[PDB]
Design an enzyme around this catalytic site. Structure first.
Site, PDB file in Angstrom:
ATOM      1  N   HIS B  33      40.356  26.313  -9.185  1.00  0.00           N
ATOM      2  CA  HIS B  33      39.738  27.642  -8.900  1.00  0.00           C
ATOM      3  C   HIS B  33      39.723  28.452 -10.179  1.00  0.00           C
ATOM      4  O   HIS B  33      38.915  29.411 -10.307  1.00  0.00           O
ATOM      5  CB  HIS B  33      40.381  28.332  -7.697  1.00  0.00           C
ATOM      6  CG  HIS B  33      41.782  28.868  -7.897  1.00  0.00           C
ATOM      7  ND1 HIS B  33      42.905  28.247  -7.450  1.00  0.00           N
ATOM      8  CD2 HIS B  33      42.197  30.067  -8.407  1.00  0.00           C
ATOM      9  CE1 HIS B  33      43.980  28.958  -7.741  1.00  0.00           C
ATOM     10  NE2 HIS B  33      43.554  30.078  -8.275  1.00  0.00           N
ATOM     11  N   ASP B  55      42.319  21.392  -5.618  1.00  0.00           N
ATOM     12  CA  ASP B  55      42.550  22.550  -6.471  1.00  0.00           C
ATOM     13  C   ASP B  55      43.056  22.044  -7.853  1.00  0.00           C
ATOM     14  O   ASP B  55      44.212  22.365  -8.162  1.00  0.00           O
ATOM     15  CB  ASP B  55      43.406  23.689  -5.897  1.00  0.00           C
ATOM     16  CG  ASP B  55      43.140  24.994  -6.601  1.00  0.00           C
ATOM     17  OD1 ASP B  55      43.616  26.094  -6.163  1.00  0.00           O
ATOM     18  OD2 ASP B  55      42.449  25.064  -7.636  1.00  0.00           O
ATOM     19  N   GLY B 135      47.697  35.100 -11.235  1.00  0.00           N
ATOM     20  CA  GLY B 135      47.977  34.867 -12.678  1.00  0.00           C
ATOM     21  C   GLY B 135      48.871  33.600 -12.765  1.00  0.00           C
ATOM     22  O   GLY B 135      48.756  32.942 -13.797  1.00  0.00           O
ATOM     23  N   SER B 137      48.619  30.862 -10.950  1.00  0.00           N
ATOM     24  CA  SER B 137      47.880  29.654 -10.617  1.00  0.00           C
ATOM     25  C   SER B 137      47.686  28.701 -11.841  1.00  0.00           C
ATOM     26  O   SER B 137      47.471  29.219 -12.910  1.00  0.00           O
ATOM     27  CB  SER B 137      46.418  29.964 -10.157  1.00  0.00           C
ATOM     28  OG  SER B 137      46.648  30.324  -8.783  1.00  0.00           O
ATOM     29  N   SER B 152      48.566  26.647  -6.645  1.00  0.00           N
ATOM     30  CA  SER B 152      47.227  26.982  -6.106  1.00  0.00           C
ATOM     31  C   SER B 152      47.189  28.400  -5.564  1.00  0.00           C
ATOM     32  O   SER B 152      46.387  29.264  -6.014  1.00  0.00           O
ATOM     33  CB  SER B 152      46.853  25.949  -5.055  1.00  0.00           C
ATOM     34  OG  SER B 152      45.597  26.316  -4.419  1.00  0.00           O
TER      35      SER B 152
END
Lengths: 4, 181
Positions: B33, B55, B135, B137, B152
């Site tokens: 993402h 992801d 932030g 992820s 994720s």
């Protein structure tokens, strides 16, 4: 939930 | 740059997952993402992305000397990474990310389905009781020197705690024929  | 450190594109920020090798060429895994946003990152160029459903995403380093095969612990030290593995319910894990730094907890579920509403649904996620914030992820989920996942998303935050979901790193490594450094 949500994407970080 | 090591696992858990900031990687940016324009005004967006994510965290690096793990530095890896693809046929000897240095790359970095992060959340899909995040890589869906742009092809141009502070560390290099995006060469792969998969979100939602999965992801994960990968970026080829502009500077191969920067591919540090460790995770930053946010206390001036690093954890060396040597392998990738699969998580198990009850495992003691740590997560490193650029908003909240290093946090610890344990795996509470496997193969969880996560609906992110307008962003879509992801399947097969590792579930933990570790907190995370926007932030974080793409950052590293690990146990000692074994890499396990990429942050994720989730619910809550690091003050109230929450639930977080991670993309299993072995699926991302096999998608790209990569090995952890």
């Amino acid at each position: 939930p949500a994407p970080f | 740059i090591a696992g858990g450190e900031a990687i940016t594109t324009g005004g967006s920020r994510c965290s690096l997952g793990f530095n890896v090798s693809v046929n000897g060429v240095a790359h970095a895994l992060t959340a899909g993402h995040c890589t869906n946003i742009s092809a141009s990152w502070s560390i290099g160029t995006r060469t792969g992305t998969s979100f939602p459903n999965n992801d994960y995403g990968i970026i080829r380093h502009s500077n191969p000397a920067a591919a540090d095969g460790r995770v930053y612990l946010y206390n001036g030290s690093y954890q060396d990474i040597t392998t990738a593995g699969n998580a198990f319910v009850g495992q003691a894990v740590q997560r490193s990310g650029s908003t909240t730094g290093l946090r610890s907890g344990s795996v509470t579920g496997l193969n969880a389905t996560v609906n992110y509403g307008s962003s879509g649904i992801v399947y097969g996620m590792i579930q933990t009781n570790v907190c995370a914030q926007p932030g974080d992820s793409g950052g590293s989920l690990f146990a000692g020197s074994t890499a396990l996942g990429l942050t994720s998303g989730g619910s809550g935050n690091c003050r109230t705690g929450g639930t977080t979901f991670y993309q299993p790193v072995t699926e991302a490594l096999s998608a790209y024929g990569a090995t952890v450094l």
